[PDB]
Amino acid sequence: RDEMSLESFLGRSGCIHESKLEVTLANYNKENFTVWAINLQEMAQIRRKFELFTYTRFDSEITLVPCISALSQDIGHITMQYMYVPPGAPVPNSRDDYAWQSGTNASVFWQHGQAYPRFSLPFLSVASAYYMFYDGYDEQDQNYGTANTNNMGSLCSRIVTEKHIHKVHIMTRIYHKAKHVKAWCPRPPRALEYTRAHRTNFKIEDRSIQTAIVTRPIITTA
Amino acid sequence: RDEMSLESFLGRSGCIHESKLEVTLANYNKENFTVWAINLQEMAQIRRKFELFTYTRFDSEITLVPCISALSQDIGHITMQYMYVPPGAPVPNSRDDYAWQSGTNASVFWQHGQAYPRFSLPFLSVASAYYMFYDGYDEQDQNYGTANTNNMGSLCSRIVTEKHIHKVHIMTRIYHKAKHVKAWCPRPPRALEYTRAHRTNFKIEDRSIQTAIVTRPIITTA
Amino acid sequence: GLPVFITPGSGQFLTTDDFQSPCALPWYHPTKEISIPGEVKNLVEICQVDSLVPINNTDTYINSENMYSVVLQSSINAPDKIFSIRTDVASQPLATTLIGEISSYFTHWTGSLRFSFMFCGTANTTVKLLLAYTPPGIAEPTTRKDAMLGTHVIWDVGLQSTISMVVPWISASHYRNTSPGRSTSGYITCWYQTRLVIPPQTPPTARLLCFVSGCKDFCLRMARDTNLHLQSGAIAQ
Amino acid sequence: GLPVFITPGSGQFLTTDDFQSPCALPWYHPTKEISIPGEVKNLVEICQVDSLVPINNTDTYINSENMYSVVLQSSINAPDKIFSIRTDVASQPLATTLIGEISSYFTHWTGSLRFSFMFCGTANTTVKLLLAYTPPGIAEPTTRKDAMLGTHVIWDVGLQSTISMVVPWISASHYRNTSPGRSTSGYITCWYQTRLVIPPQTPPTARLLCFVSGCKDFCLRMARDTNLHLQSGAIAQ
Amino acid sequence: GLPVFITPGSGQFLTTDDFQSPCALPWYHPTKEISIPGEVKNLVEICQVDSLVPINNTDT
Amino acid sequence: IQITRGDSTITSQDVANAIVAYGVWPHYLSSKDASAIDKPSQPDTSSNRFYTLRSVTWSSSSKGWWWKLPDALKDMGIFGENMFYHYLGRSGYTIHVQCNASKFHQGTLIVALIPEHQIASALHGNVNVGYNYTHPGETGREVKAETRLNPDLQPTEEYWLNFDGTLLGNITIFPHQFINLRSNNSATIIAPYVNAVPMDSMRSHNNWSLVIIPICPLETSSAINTIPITISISPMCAEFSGARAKRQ
DSSP states (O other): OOSHHHHHHSSSSSEEEEEEEEEOOSSSSOOOOOOOOOOSOOSSEEEHHHTTTTTEEEEEEEEEEEOOOOOOOOOOOOEEEEEEETTTTTOOOOSSSSSTTTSEEEEEEBBBBBOOOOOOOOOOOSSEEESOOOSSSSSSSOOSSSSSSSSOOOEEEEEEOSSSSOEEEEEEEEEEEOOOOEEEEOOOOOOSSOSSOOOOOSTTTTOOOOOOOOOOSSSSSO | OOOBBBBSSSSSSSEEEEEEEOSSOSSSOOOOOOOOOOOOOOOOOHHHTTTOOOOEEEEEEEEEEEEEOOSTTTTTOOOOEEEETTSSSSOOOOOSSSSTOOOSOOOOOOOOBBBEEEEEOOOOOOSSHHHHESOOSSSSOOOOSOOSSSOOOOEEEEEEOOOSOOOEEEEEEEEEEEEEEEEEEOOOOSSSOOOOOOOOSSSSSTOOOOSSSSOOSSSSSS | OOOBBBTOOOBBBBSOOOOOOOOSSOOOOOOOOOSSSSSBBHHHHHHSOOOOOOOOOOTTTTTTTGGGSSSOOSSSSSSEEEEEEESSSTTTTSSSSSSHHTTTTTTTTEEEEEEEEESSOOOOOOOOEEEEEESEEEEEEEETSSSSSSSSSEOOOOSSOOOOOOOOOOOOOOOOOOOOOOSOOOOEEEESOOOBBBBSSSSOOOOOOOOEEEEEEEEOOOOOSSSSSOOSSSOOO | OOOBBBBOOOOSSSSSOOOOOOBBBBTTOOOOOOOOOOEEEBHHHHSSOOOEOOOOOOTTTTTTTEEESOOOOSSSSSSSSEEEEETTTSHHHHTHHHHHHHHHTTSSOOOEEEEOBBBBSSSTOOOEEEEEEEEEOOOOOOOSTTSSSEEEEOOOSSSOOOOOOOOOOSSSSOOOESSSSSSSSEEEEEESOOOOBBSSSSSOOBBBBBBEEEEEEOOOOOOOOOSOOOOOOOOOO | OOOOOOOOOOOOOOOSSOOOOOOOOOOOOOOOOOOOOOOOOSSSSHHHHHOOOOOOOOOO | OOOOSSSOSSSSOEEEEOOSSSSSOOOOSSSSSSOOOSSOOOOOOOGGOOOEEEOOOSSSOOOOOOEETTTSSSSSSSHHHHHHHHHOEEEEEEEEEEEOOSSSSOOOEEEEEEEOOOEEEEOSSSOOOOOHHHHOOOOOOOOOOOSSSSSOOOOOOOOOTTTBBBBGGGGSSSEEEOSSSSSSSOEEEEEEEEEEEEEEOSSSOEEEEEEEEEEEEOOOOOOOOOOOOEEEEEEEEEEEEOOOOSSO
């Protein structure tokens, strides 16, 4: 009556990307960061929910879960920076360039002693709706799958400590939740498995035409 | 007048299962998790309370108490995942399958620095009442004790850290409390001791017919 | 502005607590309530049910049907003594009754008990039996002379069910310890006054019912663990 | 003064939660809403859409257009049996339909289904076919004699679309398990009563449509993961 | 939204303090009050009582 | 005197005396606590009638007996084949079980009604009650200390252990009635449908179970010492949903 809605169907905390940061024994410069761009179509458990609609309109909620593990000399008492860059803006890849020390980007800090990282995000799409499937091409001729209109931003974690560094694993898992869920125009579900982002492939890896449909021998006995 | 109720009789924090997780020195894959399924009839101190009723209707409250002990290289600065899976749904047994990274399952995280893990749960039974005793059989012929209708879910704890691991004891004790207590149809108490789950045995382990009833010699002196 | 201070005592581990915390999955709609009897809000309804007393719980009658029934004989030669039991619910054999084991889950208890004993034999047998109560002050006097002394009613076997008399709660305070008191509370005693009168060619052996039930006024405060059942052996996972 | 105490249960990790936390960038003004159809607030509109049933999902017809259509023959020699399918939405071949795969994302389900089957061949063919429903109590009886026994309506090929009959939800409780039940719920059966009557020089081979749609009353509670698709191979970053 | 800030001075150890913290077992009903004399709310009643003075508290 | 409801009636009804079962009338289920319709075809209106069962032998040293409902009636009456092919249903009961009594001999019996069973069957390994023992029929379980079906799934036959795992005498927690001789010669207890599910199976699941435990056995020194028991059960609120073939 009330629970049967798109608010409950898409409103679940699910892991989207496995961001794993490993500390190198020796580095010339601060170049220890995970390279990852924004995406909604990643895993089969979450993508099939987006494959069921043409255009969606909902705000995003991002929960960061970083894992701390000690290895040598009780290493773990450190504070890390998690900065978000607005969509469209150019993103550098260094210690302190133009973006990492600016008052235009959203910045948050976490240290062990307080609660787990949890914050809300506003509207991300440039148009009225979020692009799930971009039919044809935009202003370019060849590119299909990822469009300039479907932009959300970028998430990168950066190291702060300079000399006092040792090999520690920082497993920063990102969870996603939906808010203000309003979508239109339902679609039929996907039949086969996914291989690449924004792509539903049939003829790939030379695998047989075996669908998820279970076969029955005589359809009279069952 | 008001305290004499089923709300106070069943409304006490009692330990149900002793979940003990031990870290192996060397493992090929992430296979360190405690195997435990949902149950209400476990210990004699808690079961006799449920043995006094045919059908119950109350929401559950689960409190997790994990113990951290240091052994080598100050190991203890780690964050663990405690995920709950809805009843009826299939549960895998690996690091990251379909359930562990989905937005359909209830997930909670705990690290030392915040308060002790404590959360509430909704209705669990598929019918109007929770099944204490399932008379006869369901759609199957042989199985007695645990039924498909009496399903609550599954609780499993999973490791996050990859390479930085050492032998540490994680004693995650689970406490249970009752909410919205409304039950009907009282029963007489159990006479003997319990051996297995959902079973009250008389002829087992070849023990003598000695009941908890204290014997008096002449019933005239006392 | 915002009051940011950690209050001493709050924000820590506690056994019994009330929380207004948000639910894990509140979107699910539970199954609607249907009319089902046996509904209990108070613990008075369980105590209201008449529980049968095992008056003869000896080692000889423990594995038989005769443990709950009273042994009676028509012959006039044996002493007039039948039984001598306590009034405490947390004592044998009143501990095995429905009201007894529920009282084991409480530290403080108070209330009165209803006593009715009806004939179990044939229709052509009448016997006057005396029911007596004895104060807990001094040791129990067990003689034939102490029959009509202090709360004494003789019941004759007729047609009606046994009407209960005054068996009150005797204490200066409202609450008393639940520990097994063998001399703390009063005693229930019954004596042979007449022997089973039967016509020629009639079975001499007959028995008697033994019932007990809770009264109107019952007030129990703090709960505890039972002292009858213990588990330390093999348990299921 | 200020209540400073950490409440047990609150201030920790939780999967499903509602927050009134401040936004990261609330200064941005979103694009205005325009009139776009297909707007869904409930999940009843997706179930309202008529989904075609693959009645003949055998290994022979799996890679053809004949899998969704019913095989019919004009000759009067073969047995009168057509098909025997379940009523459960989480079972083959009703699992592949629009309402089936949505039901796979839920643990508890209830509701009725609409059944209409129209002719696919030529205009000059009339054939009376019987639609029957069978209780799940005993094993399915498949004979010609069990045609007019329990919920039986014969449909003749005329001009109108097939009007649906009573296919109700049969259960004591409002909710039942979503697990594939091959004997838990009822069965949908159709039988040949008459053979395809055709004039001289007319194609004997003809087919039949197979539609299913959700009714008015639908109530689904808790959500779950699908059991048809699994991913463990190569994934994109 | 919700004011989340730790106030300096609050959330620490204190000797004399007043708390409105929930009880451990509030379901128990206490024994009713009966008429008993000697009831004191102030410390003036103890001082009101005439105390005898040991005027000759020598070693003898 | 007789209870007027159907064309077929039984004698020796006397005065209906029983303790009230928590203030509950055998309610005819309306369309309030059910689905939309769930009514394909209405059964017999005069189905609410008394059914006489075959009299069982009374032993000198009586241990006790038990009958499961609606397992005891499976081939009795017209409603026998109906509920088997009809998918799931609910039914109330009007119990009238007694024996002939005179003003000479002795014998007292207590009747209880508990719809659950949990008895020991095997040793150490998975224990499970027998399928044939849960469904004996009209004869029931003739409780005698003997070997049945060799050593296998076998619930122990003990009256004081109450089978389910409860203390004797204290079993009177559910609707209970004590029957003597001078006060009462006939037993009548009101029994409605009490279950978590509105409709359940009759082939595997048991709705109720009648408990027959004697406190004073038949001990008489006369010419005859056998008094057979007359069992009369009247089903209430017979409503079933499911259309199926008669012959299979």
